[PDB]
Design a protein around this ligand. Structure first.
Ligand code: 4YW
Length: 302
């Protein structure tokens, strides 16, 4: 097929500074940083992911770098560059509000119907881009959707992309290990359910092994209290046995966009209209020198 002409940018360790730790798990550690290129008079807020040094782990992080550098879309997280230190590290765009899952849980009392429906459009938009690029995500969840600003979200975590989370997986993905663009549609359905429930855990209490039988019996995730039958019908359509019967991401963009025009007709939230989330309208919305700071989305070299 088509040659992948993507540019892999190698960055100097001296060009960036680690400020604080954002998340440290089994993978290694993710830091909040600032990237000050050569003499460009700019400060780019970054997220640096560093890994001991084992040849097996280094191969895995370089494959994630391959996928991340191959994508480019307003609703998909891109790799800015890599630094070849003794350990090796990925330089990514800082998403100050973290993952959408923690965001909906922590801000439920101020998340209105407009935001929820706009996020659905945005996720479908990124997922439709991944489809056009012939790339299957294989791990779409509210935990893998990051928040740049409350009004702008992007899809991330390409550790399993390709050109186990059972409770987000499609039927063919569990029983036959079949991963298609339509199997990501099932994962999108669970993602939307997570949002509409304000970060509630899918199939809570139920073990992962029983899921296979439950889905074959016809049991699916319940209707969230805020959901009208209009929004729930879409979630249900994402969970059909026949993958071709499930909606396409371009249809999902259209469907949620129609709903985003009159959000109170499709999502019933007590306190809607009087709710508000941070925005560039806020006084001091944006530690050391914040003079010379620009986002990665605006910093582009020819
Ligand atoms: C709490 C928090 N604050 C963040 C700010 N900015 C990013 N930036 C980005 C940009 C692109 N991708 C990513 N992800 C890539 C995959 C990783 S990992 C280390 O789990 O592989 C998680 C974040 N983060 C990630 C952030 N986090 C994550 C640890 C969830």
């Amino acid at each position: 097929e088509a040659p992948n002409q993507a540019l892999l940018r190698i960055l100097k360790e001296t060009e960036f500074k680690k400020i604080k730790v954002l998340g440290s798990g089994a993978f290694g550690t993710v830091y909040k940083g600032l990237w000050i290129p050569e003499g460009e008079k700019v400060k780019i807020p970054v997220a640096i992911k560093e890994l001991a040094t084992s040849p097996k782990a280094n191969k895995e992080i370089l494959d994630e770098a391959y996928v991340m550098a191959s994508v480019d879309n307003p609703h998909v997280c891109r790799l800015l560059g890599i630094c070849l230190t003794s350990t090796v590290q990925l330089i990514m765009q800082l998403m100050p509000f973290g993952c959408l899952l923690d965001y909906v849980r922590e801000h439920k009392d101020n998340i209105g119907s407009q935001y929820l429906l706009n996020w659905c459009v945005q996720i479908a938009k990124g997922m439709n881009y991944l489809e056009d690029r012939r790339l299957v995500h294989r791990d779409l969840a509210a935990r893998n959707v990051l928040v740049k600003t409350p009004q702008h979200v992007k899809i991330t975590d390409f550790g399993r992309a390709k050109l186990v989370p059972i409770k987000w997986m499609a039927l063919e993905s569990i029983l036959h290990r079949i991963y298609t663009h339509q199997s990501d549609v099932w994962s999108y359905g669970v993602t939307v359910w997570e949002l509409m429930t304000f970060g509630s855990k899918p199939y809570d209490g139920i073990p992962a092994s029983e899921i296979s039988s439950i889905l074959e019996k016809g049991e699916r995730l319940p209707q969230p209290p805020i959901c009208t039958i209009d929004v729930y019908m879409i979630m249900v359509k994402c969970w059909m046995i026949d993958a071709d019967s499930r909606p396409k991401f371009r249809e999902l963009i259209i469907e949620f966009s129609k709903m985003a025009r009159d959000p109170q007709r499709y999502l019933v939230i007590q306190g809607d209209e009087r709710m508000h989330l941070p925005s560039p309208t806020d006084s001091n919305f944006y530690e050391e020198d914040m003079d010379d700071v620009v986002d990665a989305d605006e910093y582009l070299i020819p």
